[PDB]
């Protein structure tokens, strides 16, 4: 249920695989959807969720160089994926930028995002 | 720098290898110690960090399931590390469980962790 | 503006007043809604924003305690206001709960919270 | 309770609360420069029947970055426990709401910990 395309509210695509062995691997692409704006993405899940209706957890890590700009940055997402229907993830995440130590009090960010399987 | 063994303020360990690719790799073994606790890490970091002074924002996600426990649930550690002689790794964290729809809104939890090279 | 009566996703309902000095004052109240689920809450909020549209700036927090019940823990809820057409209120929030020592790492729920003027 | 008085962070600020028996926390916050000018008005809550285990009192309070001499558009709230003793302590996470637009509201929001001493 995990592995493809889902997207964000805000203009984001994720595409991911889930691998047999918890591993996630795949690749974010920002808003603008350019070869410019892809990064690559990995992560762990529960490859053995309870089957009582509660979600599978996951994570996953992108850090925010590539081949064409580096903004010195991180994201993980950490939350849970949940099926049928109305398939969604939903997560929490914490942003952090590289900062000298004075600054280092304003280095993280913290939201919140849903990804679906249709825009 | 960022390859070797980290201890927490706790007792956990973190072994990772930094990749010339941007590639976080390791193992997660909480306080005991046993091979009951070890877990398997992946993650990302800034292989192109800033020369002016700032740390190198990274992050990783730990799933707690091995081949003896499974907690459904994962941890995301999002920070820097700083270095220099008392190189350390300044986080913050979220850990969810996996749960129902009814009781997601406490499915979150949020705290920091420092590591550093001596335990 | 600010005050008045909103409403969360999930059932509840956050009773405020906004000051003229900045204090916000009030009632929460969990989804249940008798009497042994309200709570006073306390928080400030920036009486003079910016006219460049951006939102309103504002906090609060509640002790779960009453005369009912304590659950030894308390919510601050970090946010802004948004004004409009359909007025909103964006919120984070952070639970911490009383521990030992020990237990102190796993004192702390992260969530998010949107209070709208029409109940859900 | 226990809370009442002066408490100091890393980085310089300081807190002169007074803890009302009815759960109140109000005060005054001053950054590090000291002056008038940096300090703001706090308004929080505690629980007033802490458990007697050992654990910590639960507690929470919001600052809006505001006072008659500048506006930051901002406010902060912080969420953790007193701990008492010998070497007493209050340790938070805090959330830091900025005013943004539409735009860049998922920036909005920063995130962090301070540990509040008695002594400097």
């Known amino acids: 249920g995990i592995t493809g395309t889902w997207y964000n509210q805000l203009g984001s695509t994720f595409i991911v695989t889930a691998g047999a062995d918890g591993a996630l691997t795949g690749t974010y692409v920002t808003a603008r959807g350019n070869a410019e704006s892809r990064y690559v993405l990995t992560g762990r899940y529960d490859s053995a969720p309870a089957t009582d209706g509660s979600g599978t957890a996951l994570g996953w890590t992108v ?57």
Request: proline residues 0%.
């Open 63 to 119: 850090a925010w160089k590539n081949n064409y700009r580096n903004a010195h940055s991180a994201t993980t997402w950490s939350g849970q994926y949940v099926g049928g229907a109305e398939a969604r993830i939903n997560t929490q995440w914490l942003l952090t930028s590289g900062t000298t130590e004075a600054n280092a009090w304003k280095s993280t960010l913290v939201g919140h995002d849903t990804f679906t399987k249709v825009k």
